[PDB]
């Protein structure tokens, strides 16, 4: 809703195709 087209994509992670150390935990919780 903010109208930020680039929102929520972290320059140092998603923009570099790098994952942080704990984000996989979130994904696992959505599936398991």
């Amino acid at each position: 809703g903010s109208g930020e087209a680039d929102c929520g994509l972290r320059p140092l992670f998603e923009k570099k195709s790098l994952e942080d150390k704990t984000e996989r935990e979130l994904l696992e919780s959505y599936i398991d």
Partner: protein
């Protein structure tokens, strides 16, 4: 944050610190949702039982930080506030219902590797992600235990809890504008927001578009990280219409 770990650099670039100017003190967490808009909890600004009613001139935000105390040159940005907006139906008398506030920055903040806004949820993202058992992430520089303070931004991931379990966990009346998160007694894992983390973001990463969305604002709890107790969070999507109204009207 109790029972979390050190954030990585740039891991939460929407993270905002809300300060009192004088004396120098960290009040609350907050979040960057655009170049001029910051989201926090209403109780961080207005709580009459403690004679708390901060004006724009009382306060300051710091953006782009990693260390709690150390100055991070040409990375961190300090911003003054133009205007505070508290939700009209914010209820401090009973249960902190509608615990949400927006703060407009005096001048827009430049985005960087360390400064970058979080998304607000649409109806499909809310439907998809705000489900019991699904984990979100809480971040802040608040107390490390219920009693102190970390040198570096802390992070913990916490599961959303089923509403009857939330309701049974507290004698306080809970509303549809709240949800609760945290581990149950028998789940083994631990974690909570604590004093100084309130107002900060509860975020979830969408598997559909790889974006982070702020689903919650750290609102209230009874202690930090007690067995059979849970943190309560303002339900951001439920209050989306108010957020939009404020930005659309006063973002001039």
């Amino acid at each position: 944050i109790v029972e979390g770990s050190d954030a990585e650099i740039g891991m939460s670039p929407w993270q905002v610190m809300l300060f009192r100017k004088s004396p120098q003190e960290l009040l609350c967490g907050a979040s960057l949702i655009s170049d001029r808009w910051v989201l926090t909890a209403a109780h961080c600004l207005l709580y009459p039982p403690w004679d708390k009613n901060f004006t724009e001139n009382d306060l300051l935000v710091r953006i782009g930080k990693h260390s709690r105390t150390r100055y991070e040159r040409n990375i961190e940005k300090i911003s003054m506030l133009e205007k505070i907006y508290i939700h009209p139906r914010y209820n401090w008398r009973e249960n902190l219902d509608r615990d949400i506030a927006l703060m407009k920055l005096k001048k827009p903040v430049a985005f960087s590797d360390y400064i970058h806004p979080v998304c607000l949820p649409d109806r499909e993202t809310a439907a998809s992600l705000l489900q019991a058992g699904y984990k979100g992430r809480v971040t802040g520089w608040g107390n490390l235990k219920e009693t102190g303070q970390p040198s570096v931004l802390q992070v913990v991931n916490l599961p959303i809890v089923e509403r009857p379990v939330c309701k049974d966990s507290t004698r306080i009346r809970i509303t549809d504008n709240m949800f609760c998160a945290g581990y149950k007694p028998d789940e083994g894992k631990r974690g909570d927001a604590c004093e100084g983390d309130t107002g900060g973001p509860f975020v979830m990463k969408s598997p559909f578009n790889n974006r982070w969305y702020q689903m919650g604002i750290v609102s209230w709890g009874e202690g930090c990280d007690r067995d059979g107790k849970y943190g309560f969070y303002t339900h951001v999507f439920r209050l989306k219409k108010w957020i939009q109204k404020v930005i659309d009207q006063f973002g001039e």
